[PDB]
Design a protein around this ligand. Sequence first.
Ligand SMILES: [Mg+2]
Ligand SMILES: [Mg+2]
Ligand SMILES: [Mg+2]
Ligand SMILES: [Mg+2]
Ligand SMILES: [Zn+2]
Lengths: 64, 225, 129, 267, 102
Amino acid sequence: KTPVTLAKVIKVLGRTGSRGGVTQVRVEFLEDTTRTIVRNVKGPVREGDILVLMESEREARRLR
Amino acid sequence: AVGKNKRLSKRVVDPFTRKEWYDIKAPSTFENRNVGKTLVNKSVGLKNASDSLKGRVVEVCLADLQGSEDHSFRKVKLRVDEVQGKNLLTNFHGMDFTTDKLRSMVRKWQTLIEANVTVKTSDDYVLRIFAIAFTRKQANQVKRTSYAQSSHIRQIRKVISEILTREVQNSTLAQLTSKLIPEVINKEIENATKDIFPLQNVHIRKVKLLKQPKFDLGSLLSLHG
Amino acid sequence: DNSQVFGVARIFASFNDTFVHVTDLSGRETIARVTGGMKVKADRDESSPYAAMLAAQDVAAKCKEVGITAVHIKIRATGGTRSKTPGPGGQAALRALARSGLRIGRIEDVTPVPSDSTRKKGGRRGRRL
Amino acid sequence: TSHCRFYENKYPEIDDIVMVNVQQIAEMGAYVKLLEYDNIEGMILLSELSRRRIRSIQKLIRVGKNDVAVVLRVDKEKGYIDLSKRRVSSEDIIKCEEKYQKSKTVHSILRYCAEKFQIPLEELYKTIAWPLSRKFGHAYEAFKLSIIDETVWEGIEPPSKDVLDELKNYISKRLTPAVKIRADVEVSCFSYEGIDAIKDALKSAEDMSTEQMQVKVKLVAAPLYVLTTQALDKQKGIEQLESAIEKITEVITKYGGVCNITMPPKA
Amino acid sequence: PKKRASNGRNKKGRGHVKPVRCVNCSRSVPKDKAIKRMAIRNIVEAAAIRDLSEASVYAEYALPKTYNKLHYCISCAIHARIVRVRSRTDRRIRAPPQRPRF
RNA sequence: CUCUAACUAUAAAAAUCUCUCUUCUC
Ligand SMILES: [Mg+2]
Ligand SMILES: [Mg+2]
Ligand SMILES: [Mg+2]
Ligand SMILES: [Mg+2]
Ligand SMILES: [Zn+2]
């Protein structure tokens, strides 16, 4: 199948990673807007973007 | 992954076509007597399943047997002994606490007192019972610790031991379980040691079982329905 | 009860290669044993949350085909004389079990904790690293 | 044109061992071409490339050379492979070697056939190699049989009978083998007449020798008589040596001496 | 010289106590010198509380906690961030770090 | 002038180093 889902960030939880080049945000689904995840992003984001996810059960873990 | 040195030192089937479900029936001392279902191989003439069922020990939360949630942290093990066909009967096998509650009450700055007693009930069932109690900070104790001296602990152990012996030798595990459900032994043990020491959280945990006399069908069927 | 056919999830999450192993109430019958190392490549991420996630999806699918609709979680650490703290993957395994339609009842921790260890491996000075 | 994969389908299976020629290396990994199968590309990643710590890639991979690998995931829509290299057991590489070697032989033979007949390898493989692989699991055993027993060409349709004739000619030209089966018998005779005994023994030995394979009893030591045979069929020479041993036993049993055995007939 | 008048052990009048093993490196360390941390946590964290609540029978099921007293080593305690090097006038303070949250 | 609640979770490898030291009295 093609379970491509979307998720609009509601807040950005600083920038993580050893490189210092990835960030961590709290995304909320376009559907069921009470269901949120924490996810890692690689690039410039701000409050308002719509990420595309091929997963929904994954949660972000701080990169070391 | 998918790695295996193949150090071996299609005839494939689905093992669920040759299987079915039996039902677990609780003793009448509990309310929700419909416990659950158990998966079993299909009956074979050479080896009958009903032989294989007997001896099974199902582990069920006590609150799942009485509907309430005051018995959430307890747990009861039932023994499969008699199969009526598409429905089997379970006798009491043991009791235990949930580790969550046990660790929840085993806290610092108070002495835990443990009482152990191996006894014989009114019938020839032989049981082992463990009781656990915790000294209680008084409702006026500005002193922060709540420790108990060794003399108080030994006296409390003696009292709990004699109470447990009394309430085992004077009843059967049918009546004993019917007594365990409303944990009146806990209240009685707390009251009998009220003068010695406060003793918060007097509980009876891990009611073991060490022997069964014979196979008495009459009371087992009498215990159901 | 509305005939929720029950099982026990019985997760075992060591510090490597967590286990998801559902059984009936008795526990004498084992179905859908698929583990963490069953589904992930690196051989080092058997403990990873993704490993337990895929293992959990497989056991959920297999049990749903069976007929069992609700499960009882029995989380176990490696236990014994070992670390006995729950593995990283077990929590993801439980979350994915609760995701895939299955109903959840009576989470318990059943790690084998001793009244004492016989002897803990590593010597008196332990693992020097 | 080397194409038309060895197996009955152009795509891999989920667990197989394979061998690969590297074509290039990128930063995330190398998308390289499979040789156990025809040409389909797939990734080997650096994290699952080397056994030890990946300090260098030029020393390990050696682009343009042949390595062992396995396949973990497959794209069965347009063709893409996920492969592995660290998970090759000590036993895996040996059977990979033998499988690739037999495949390479059966590939080079039919590549010569295609080049001499100027017909694409696809049709030739579909007409000859595929039914033989169906019948006996692999065409090389069929080639060995055709060397020995010629019934293997019954029921198979070539594009033309000239193709079969030229292929049989190349079988006779290229796959020439025998096996040097050697045994050593201890002579222990101290009897009265003992040279006419050996003379009669090898007179009988060369009497039974078939036209296709020779029988000669070589002398290296007075006790140690060596028997060397060129097993063309690899199963009748042992019978030949056993019959010779029977004859020598019949010779020695009545002159007055005895003999012993050190090396029975062994390849 | 004495870096610690308490010598670190916190024994003062026993002579010998029974050692305990490290959770990480399994170092046989005396039970009083060893750093003990009581990890009481939730068997399911806030990351899955909503999911479990929606997908669980027994409405308002009080989910259980998990309790473990961890007996760390001391090299491990420095390395695993459990305990930190302190100023020489700050080593005086033995009160825990002021109630992380109220 | 009355008060005990929240939380996790990193240990790959790294050996050695030939000078030469110089005054404070208003
Ligand atoms: Mg160190
Ligand atoms: Mg010093
Ligand atoms: Mg200290
Ligand atoms: Mg003293
Ligand atoms: Zn340590």
